[PDB]
């Protein structure tokens, strides 16, 4: 029918017992589906940027290249992050969700979604987490929108899955509005470790401090999926507000089921937990893009539908 939600504080969290109580209490406020451990804990690292001294020599390609260039280093830092004074887990490998193979018939999606390791999603999966391939790619926009359907579809698109962001926060339209494409690194955890998550958040905050950021980060959100039966320039400054958290609510209603069905993981009976977002802010400059200017500059093999 629809995705129902239930939110619990982050301060003291523990997954509900599976069968400790045969019958839940009558005045219990918890939903009846909030029984077992979640399928996964989705941690999103929202990466926003701003080219502060914007000038007229920037192009639409740079609006994508400048933030996505940092994506590979950010993914490597997240993957290699280790808690230096841990008492429990140390590395991402001990807690994140492991995926073996995509479903047969997804030969087209092979080498675009991770396999045989941690389920970490980012725009770098287009170039297979290879900054050399990213730098040698002649059309970043063409590669990103290569697998875009020409009509609306129920399933989430590959670009939507990899960016983890609603379409209005990306796309070549932001160049006209002088904004910058903002993406999200999606971490999928099999286990929840408060200390590791706090260390990761603090490490990212230390690496890329976000000014004027006051995100609450106070509650988890659990989403339950029911069964389906049919029978002059003034470049805009990076602003963090109440709409930046809970940005997953603006994604497609088939986003997470589409992602998890690719790996033969079902969400029909179970639920997932969405951790509070980790803000990351990048300060970019136009000189980087100007020096990284390439041939085949203003021509791309992708025309968005404009009628």
């Amino acid at each position: 029918t629809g995705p129902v939600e239930f939110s619990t504080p982050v301060k003291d969290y523990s997954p509900p017992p599976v069968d400790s109580d045969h019958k839940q209490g009558e005045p219990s406020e918890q939903p009846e589906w909030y029984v077992g451990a979640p399928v996964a804990y989705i941690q999103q690292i929202f990466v926003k940027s701003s080219v502060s001294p914007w000038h007229k020599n920037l192009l639409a390609v740079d609006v994508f290249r400048l933030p996505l260039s940092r994506a590979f280093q950010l993914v490597e830092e997240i993957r290699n992050h280790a808690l230096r004074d841990s008492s429990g887990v140390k590395s991402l490998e001990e807690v994140c969700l492991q995926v073996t193979d995509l479903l047969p018939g997804l030969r087209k999606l092979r080498n675009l979604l991770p396999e045989h390791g941690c389920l970490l999603l980012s725009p770098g999966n287009f170039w297979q987490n290879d900054w050399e391939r990213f730098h040698a790619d002649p059309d970043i926009i063409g590669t990103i929108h290569q697998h875009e359907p020409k009509t609306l579809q129920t399933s989430a698109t590959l670009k939507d899955l990899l960016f983890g962001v609603p379409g209005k926060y990306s796309g070549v339209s932001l160049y006209t509005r002088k904004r910058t494409v903002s993406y999200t690194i999606t971490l999928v955890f099999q286990r929840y470790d408060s200390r590791f998550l706090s260390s990761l958040r603090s490490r990212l905050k230390l690496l890329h401090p976000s000014p004027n950021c006051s995100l609450r980060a106070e509650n988890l959100v659990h989403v339950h999926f029911k069964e389906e039966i049919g029978i002059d320039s003034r470049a805009p400054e990076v602003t963090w507000g109440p709409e930046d958290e809970e940005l997953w609510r603006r994604l497609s209603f088939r986003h997470w089921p589409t992602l998890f069905n690719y790996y033969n993981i079902t969400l029909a009976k179970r639920y997932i937990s969405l951790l509070p977002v980790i803000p990351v802010t990048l300060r970019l400059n136009p000189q980087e893009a100007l020096e990284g200017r390439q041939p085949q500059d203003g021509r791309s093999a992708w025309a968005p539908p404009e009628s």
Partner: antibody
Amino acid sequence: EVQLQQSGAELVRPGASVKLSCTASGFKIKDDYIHWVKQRPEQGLEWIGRIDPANGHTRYAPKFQDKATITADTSSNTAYLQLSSLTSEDTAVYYCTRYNDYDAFYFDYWGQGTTLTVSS
Amino acid sequence: DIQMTQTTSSLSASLGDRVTISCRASQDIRNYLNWYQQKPDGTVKLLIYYTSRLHSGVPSRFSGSGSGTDYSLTISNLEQEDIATYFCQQTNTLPWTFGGGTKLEIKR
């Protein structure tokens, strides 16, 4: 608002043992690690070890492996440091501290320190 | 282990004058340095963590800088209450080590 209240001064014979204490106010020790730092007048500050009161996982500097033993209990919100086989080298001022950020690992709030004296 | 070295043990200064305190790491510690202040009565207080992040409540006079193996602590203008001992602590390799500490004085 956050305080770490330490015990009084100590004076023990060499070869004995002492059980230092550290009372916490304004927060609960389950939330953060509690550390202990050793200061001698001419050797500067030395890090002894830490504890995680949630699960009791303690780790020490290799110098203090056979010397220190850090224990804490949540019920009284107090952390303790134990030193065994005391000698004249062990007289110092021991500080109690914690941290709340888990990547910078900066010691956030300190106690006033307890002076320990070892002499016949 | 990593040896933290404060070359100067004492450092004379005068009120209003800016004061700089620097310490050297034995190896790269990746901007994981902490600065502490110890009053003569024995109270210890955190001033700066990471490398330049001011702790909450610490006055704006204190500032830090440095990278790799060299770091420094600066005080914009010295007040009477700023006369104390300052230590640098590295938090890169797990056995945290402190420097020798620098003690401030008054010009005579």
